Design a protein around this ligand. Structure first.
Ligand SMILES: NC(=O)c1ccc(NC2CCCC2)nc1
Ligand SMILES: NC(=O)c1ccc(NC2CCCC2)nc1
Lengths: 245, 245
């Protein structure tokens, strides 16, 4: 049986729980679920309604367009998820008003053995539920979506990569280097000879230099956040001189 | 029949095309697909393999861990999608090395009637395919995922909101205001009386003031990017004075 010491449980509150098949049935995350490294358990506010038409939205006070999620079914779904999780589960709401997710934030979230993710729909949820039920608000980026399910799945995928057993250049805060595979020549473009050389140290340094160059050209602000090693300073200076020559 | 003037077509290249049911079968985006406002068409590199085991990965030159997507099946899938799209389709690769997506970038991407989204798996794709097949590289945020499918779906959801007919505070670059619905009192927390007043102008100003205050407290850098109106300057100064009193 598969070693699952640091397994993670994620409860999800969603009006569309079948969306989560996209991560629980496919690829690396699908394998993680099958092997009990990751468990994703969903509760649907619709199931906590009592009226004949299973109403899950409600009108905002102060008017204006759009609906909000109805409080009672959503609150009851959240409470049921909390009771299942037991002690220690952090409840997260996904929205553009939340803390912006980045890889550092992913590594922080990955320290939790249990998370509950609340997925908003319509124009969102009652502010007082954020006050009374939510521990942390997070955003996956500065854009607006129709639902919090894709943000929740994005978060789950990102943190799952840190669960031991789930995997077979962002680690040092740099963009990735270019990668090449067969064929050796593709529409006249050749693989850099260093990658064919079998010189492991030259390859390492080429890849690091490329990561530094790419970060400098595309995302220079990311370099400001780093304390570069002597080697990294040298390779970046080399890259900048070559770019400039 | 449903007015579909500015309909959008999105071609997707993915080893897991069934993931896209999460947006094509549910909610607002699901309705958009059913009503022909949005079309999502998928091609799977696996279908373009010729060997007995339908191999879709390949070893990176220069070694190191991980595999890349195999060039020939992926390239052939991309070419097939391009031929289906005909003239004018922008081909996008999703990766952390791409231009960071924000709502302005969403509105730019939404001007395209046709997009093709290439979803990487494994450690990614050959750099020369980016050179020869990809028009633009985009990132949904500074974090690493197991696949480009969730980024692609995130992009599709975000741009779909701009298609006329798909919908029933980021517009001015501010965070959203708090929203309230029934009941009037929730765990001792009351709805702000202004929202019950029926005074449309006071409600508008309260909501705007809240958006300004929330943006200032949580995301002050976002204010630097705005040219505030006289009213917005006044309401922000009011909010800051109250916070400080
Ligand atoms: N950028 C984000 O992380 C994000 C989260 C939720 C969302 N929409 C939800 C929240 C309110 C109702 C739909 N859009 C965007
Ligand atoms: N932040 C992003 O937009 C993003 C895109 C693709 C991805 N992973 C893919 C790309 C390389 C192979 C898997 N991770 C993250």
């Amino acid at each position: 049986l598969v070693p699952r010491g640091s397994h993670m449980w994620i409860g999800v509150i969603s009006l569309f729980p079948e969306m989560f098949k996209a991560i629980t049935e496919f690829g690396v995350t699908g394998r993680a679920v099958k092997h009990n490294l990751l468990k994703v358990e969903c509760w649907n506010p619709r199931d906590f309604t009592f009226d004949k038409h299973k109403t899950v939205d409600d009108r905002p006070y102060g008017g204006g367009p759009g609906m909000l999620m109805m409080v009672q079914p959503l609150r009851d779904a959240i409470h049921t998820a909390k009771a299942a999780a037991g002690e220690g589960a952090k409840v997260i709401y996904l929205s553009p008003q939340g803390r912006k997710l980045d890889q550092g934030g992913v590594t922080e979230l990955a320290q939790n053995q249990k998370l509950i993710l609340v997925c908003g729909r319509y124009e969102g949820i009652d502010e007082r539920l954020i006050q009374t039920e939510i521990d942390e608000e997070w955003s996956i980026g500065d854009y607006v979506l129709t639902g919090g399910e894709l943000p929740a799945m994005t978060l789950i995928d990102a943190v799952a990569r840190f669960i031991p057993g789930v995997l077979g250049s962002f680690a040092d805060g740099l963009l990735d280097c270019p990668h090449y595979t067969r064929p050796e020549v593709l529409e006249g473009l050749t693989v850099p000879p260093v990658l064919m050389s079998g010189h492991h140290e030259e390859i390492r340094k080429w890849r690091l230099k490329q990561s530094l160059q790419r970060t400098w050209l595309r995302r220079p602000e990311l370099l400001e956040g780093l304390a570069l090693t002597d080697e990294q300073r040298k390779l970046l200076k080399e890259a900048q001189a070559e770019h400039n020559s």
